[PDB]
Design a protein around this ligand. Structure first.
Ligand SMILES: [Ca+2]
Ligand SMILES: [Ca+2]
Ligand SMILES: [Ca+2]
Ligand SMILES: [Ca+2]
Ligand SMILES: [Ca+2]
Ligand SMILES: [Ca+2]
Ligand SMILES: [Ca+2]
Ligand SMILES: [Ca+2]
Ligand SMILES: [Ca+2]
Ligand SMILES: [Ca+2]
Ligand SMILES: [Cl-]
Ligand SMILES: [Cl-]
Ligand SMILES: [Cl-]
Ligand SMILES: [Cl-]
Lengths: 619, 634
């Protein structure tokens, strides 16, 4: 930031300078004939330095008589603003050893103005990492009384916005001749809005809209003087056409010909992305939708300590995903609404005061049951301290809509991983994949449904003489079946082997992309049926469970009874309770299992946001 | 690359594996009752390793009897392809200390196929830097065939056109009977398909009809028939330069499909990828050695001086009577690849005089054409230059940075299409300057570069009205104020003396304003190029004005042609003191200490009166950079 101002030996030169900015001083054309030395003097508050044009260092210049040298340069800096027009002046006298009087004088009158646009940097760049800085802008997609109005007709809406301060110290008469403009690119204008305060902090009409869809420039009138306040709100989440950076500029113009800019200052905001929460984080609220299932959900939520929302609106986990957007001023949860259409339930009953709304309509096999996220991992040499997004798809060669894929990919904080779920009838990730908190290892355990685990369990209990134990025994009458009938069913075993191979492909992809080992994976017994189509749960799917910290709700599998207790439940306990978890089995055969869904496919959860702040993610 | 294949104790399992890919072997459930140990054996050419599932590393498994352990894993690898469908098999026997015979066997028959798609990596990433690798694809925007643009046909009407394309090899070794049951597909994304094309060879390298189009605008998949046995050749040509909507990466995939499921569907079992990067367009500054000089009624001894300087420099010369300023219409750059580095011309959106000249007379065999038509502005490729390699902002620019013109915040900027095209090359990050204050608005009106044997290897020449102030005042203090500018010119310009110029109040004030504009540009140049004062040379130059415009009072000196050691400068026709123009003497005293040879050309009638100089009427092609762009690390 350097501005060259040249002076004249025949007349004084007048210049307006910004505080802190260095000004190099030179002249138009040659020095007096016999010039051998020079002196330079400055008004109090004006710093003058001598420096070789090749040297990084500076040196005070108003204390000596310097031998003339065209390779030297004088720098003038004023850290404080002026009080009147032409407050200060710099005087350069040219001396010789022939006559005792100065050969000539060069006078530069200076008016210092302090103009700077600033925000909370937590001026021209936004950097990731532990050494990061920059303003973070929320989207404000909630209802406090919001992202649609052109006014600020609310009392706590400003708590979601970001503050911007324009310091405009200086003499008042200067602004009779100069002009201040706050502007932004029309592209950035179509992505955020700003409001200028006039009736400070009391009335909602005080905040007047000055930059928006049509407005790309606003002349700040300096109502308060030497300082103006602006409240900025983002209008768009990052997507395939929006990198996520919004820059605002302030310009001082010398107003003949036209207005000409003399100084420009910038503030660059980054739009905070949408973040998902895995089942490993502590829960906040349980959401549920005849039903002797809400009773068990309420009991388990009370045992876990979470409020519950009941809805008579007729699959609450397929329609919406509960995430959050975090900023240093406020971190509010935001709901993503699935393109499947409970189509009105998010917009109506979920948009609380601090609860934002985002959705992507493609105008459809994909729902937010197929949308999950892993715990923090380390893989491919990189770190993912907020986990990675897990979605469904096919192998290279039935995919989620491209709008949702681009939206998830563009958040940059949880790099998504595509899996193989096409082989399933409905096609949700939570049909074969789940996560659970573990007190050892990598802090968690990945639960995968394995037909081979059911093979091992049934064969082991059959070698003891319990092959005549009946599955689906204690249900409302569908067709009871024994262990010997299942193990000797050739087609069922072959199809479950195919399912196991699909889940093995997904297992290897998971171990690769999440950097997990075998000691972190737990195989849960689960068999699958087929009606000349894709795969559905034979007995209630166990991995499709709700996980609230220490308490997990698992669908009652109604497996073969050996000692008066379902041995599938005993295997689930022997696999999960060593991790300290409490296994509560819910009767989920009458309301949901016949309709291709389980508890996790009928119960949604909000979680505590991550402790790791996303600006340090270093994507 | 790990694939789990489970086996059964009740029946043998058959599996097709790709060479080199590791396969983890396990079982479905069974684990015979009293199993305490196990052995594993493999057909010759089948490598079997034991490894704990928590610690990495391998260990040969077919030499011992291992105690059974569910926490172990067996890995099977076949580095060589099979000759028949069930060439190899892996056998796992489960043993006990109670009975001497194996409790059970698990047999896995293996068919090893060697499928790999490869190119010149100079498989899934393209990385910048001195440790970089990946395939680089040219755009082939020239006319190699002596029969007609080459990038438009769907055939290859030439014998040497393929020299611009990239080679891709599909190795498909394995038993032939396997391909009666399986299928090979070469595919690409439709987006990448709309940006490049590929040709499959049939009848190697002799006939032009051998190269048949298999992936293009409509084609996003092609079933390779394996004509040449175990390996097929493909020639790829790029169709688009990187722009605001094209990141520059084009990926091709090869997929093996298990079509044994005749009635259900085809199922993929292996995918391999090759990622190409489109080579960007590179500019050449005046510091690089020149190749050809291009020049463009009522002409004079200006083509003569251009020819003399080209002969003294050793460059070809192209004369064109095409008028109804050859440097405003086109910019001569180049695109570089390890197979061949060919020059490519960018055609400016300015049209009307030489609009057809690039497409017609510049498209040689190895001479590409790129252009971006808007839908305007005053800025054209005379306003388009590039700096020598620099270091600034902590970063290095080993092939320089692009210099274009514009205004300060508040119009007169290059059209957004050209700006996005220049911004998207990523190899010479452009810098926008302040040129709006000029009448026509070209960067070469106040900025030039010259080769210097000292310093940073070059010198930046900036026009400075203050330099002319100093020169005229110094020669006036000697008593030569009555020396006349424009003396030895063709008359009606009105002759004028030094005393008239120095005492012209409005002229001096306006030239001070021009000097302030050029000072802003000077500071921006020192910041963005990391140059100091010892590398900048101020050249005396005054300017005129018709209430709004900036034009050269006397011929603009920095608007010069620079061919290595020889530079052609417009004859300024300044005040004559000792029988020689003192402006010329100052130019010599500033440039000849850098070893350069100053040749002043009398160009006052054809160009200086029409707001242009030699560099604004002569174009040049240069030697490409020695630094290869793949190491630029943007
Ligand atoms: Ca509002
Ligand atoms: Ca709000
Ligand atoms: Ca709020
Ligand atoms: Ca919806
Ligand atoms: Ca979900
Ligand atoms: Ca060609
Ligand atoms: Ca061709
Ligand atoms: Ca053109
Ligand atoms: Ca060629
Ligand atoms: Ca040019
Ligand atoms: Cl001087
Ligand atoms: Cl003087
Ligand atoms: Cl297993
Ligand atoms: Cl057995």
């Amino acid at each position: 930031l350097q501005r060259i101002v040249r002076v004249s030996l025949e007349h004084p030169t007048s210049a307006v300078c910004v505080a802190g900015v260095e000004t190099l001083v030179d002249i138009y054309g040659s020095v007096p004939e016999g010039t051998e030395m020079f002196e330079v003097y400055g008004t109090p508050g004006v710093d003058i330095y001598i420096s070789p044009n090749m040297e990084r260092g500076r040196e005070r210049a108003d204390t000596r008589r310097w031998r003339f040298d065209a390779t030297l340069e004088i720098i003038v800096v004023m850290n404080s603003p002026s009080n009147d027009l032409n407050d200060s002046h710099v005087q350069i006298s040219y001396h010789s050893s022939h006559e005792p009087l100065p050969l000539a004088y060069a006078v530069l009158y200076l008016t210092c103005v302090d103009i700077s646009l600033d925000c909370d940097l937590n001026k021209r760049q936004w950097v990731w990492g532990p050494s990061g800085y920059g303003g973070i802008l929320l989207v404000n997609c909630d209802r406090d009384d919001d992202n649609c109005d052109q006014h600020v007709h609310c009392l706590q809406d400003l708590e979601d916005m970001s503050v911007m301060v324009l310091r405009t110290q200086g003499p008042a008469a200067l602004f009779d001749d100069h002009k201040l403009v706050l502007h932004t690119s029309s592209y950035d204008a179509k992505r955020a809005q700003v409001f200028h305060i006039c009736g400070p902090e009391d009335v909602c009409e005080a905040y007047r809209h000055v930059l928006g869809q049509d407005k790309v420039s606003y002349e700040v009138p300096r109502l308060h003087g030497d300082e103006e306040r602006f409240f900025v709100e983002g209008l768009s989440f990052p997507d395939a056409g929006f990198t996520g950076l919004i820059s605002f500029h302030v310009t001082l113009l010398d107003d003949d010909f036209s207005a000409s800019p003399i100084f420009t200052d910038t503030v660059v905001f980054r739009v905070a992305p949408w973040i998902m929460t895995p089942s490993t984080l502590p829960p906040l609220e349980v959401y549920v939708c005849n039903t002797c299932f809400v009773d068990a959900v309420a009991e388990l939520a009370r045992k876990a300590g979470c409020k519950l929302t009941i809805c008579p609106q007729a699959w609450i986990q397929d329609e919406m995903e509960l995430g959050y957007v975090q900023a240093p001023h406020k971190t509010l949860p935001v709901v993503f609404d699935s393109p499947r259409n409970l189509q009105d339930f998010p917009y109506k009953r979920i948009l609380g005061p601090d609860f934002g709304y985002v959705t992507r309509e493609p105008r459809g096999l994909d729902s937010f049951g197929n949308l999950e996220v892993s715990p923090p991992v380390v893989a491919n040499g990189k770190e993912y301290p907020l986990g990675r997004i897990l979605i469904g798809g096919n192998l290279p060669g039935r995919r989620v809509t491209q709008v949702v894929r681009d939206f998830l990919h563009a958040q940059k904080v949880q790099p998504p991983v595509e899996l193989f779920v096409d082989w399933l009838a409905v096609g949700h990730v939570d049909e074969f994949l789940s996560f659970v908190p573990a007190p050892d290892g990598k802090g968690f355990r990945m639960l995968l449904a394995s037909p081979g685990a059911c093979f091992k369990l049934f064969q082991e209990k059959q070698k003891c003489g319990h092959g005549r134990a009946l599955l689906f025994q204690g249900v409302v009458d569908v067709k009871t079946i024994s262990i010997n009938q299942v193990l000797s069913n050739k087609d069922l075993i072959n199809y479950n082997k195919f399912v196991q191979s699909c889940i093995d492909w997904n297992r290897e992809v998971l171990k690769r992309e999440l950097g997990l080992a075998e000691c972190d994976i737990i195989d849960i017994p689960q068999l699958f049926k087929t009606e000349r189509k894709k795969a559905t749960a034979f007995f209630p799917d166990l991995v499709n469970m709700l996980v609230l910290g220490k308490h997990l709700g698992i669908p009652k599998p109604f497996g073969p009874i050996i000692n008066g207790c379902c041995c599938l439940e005993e295997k689930v306990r022997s696999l999960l309770e060593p991790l300290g978890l409490h296994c509560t089995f819910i009767d989920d055969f009458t309301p949901y299992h016949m309709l291709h869904g389980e508890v996790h496919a009928g119960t949604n959860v909000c979680r505590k946001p991550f402790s790791f702040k996303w600006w340090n993610m270093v994507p």
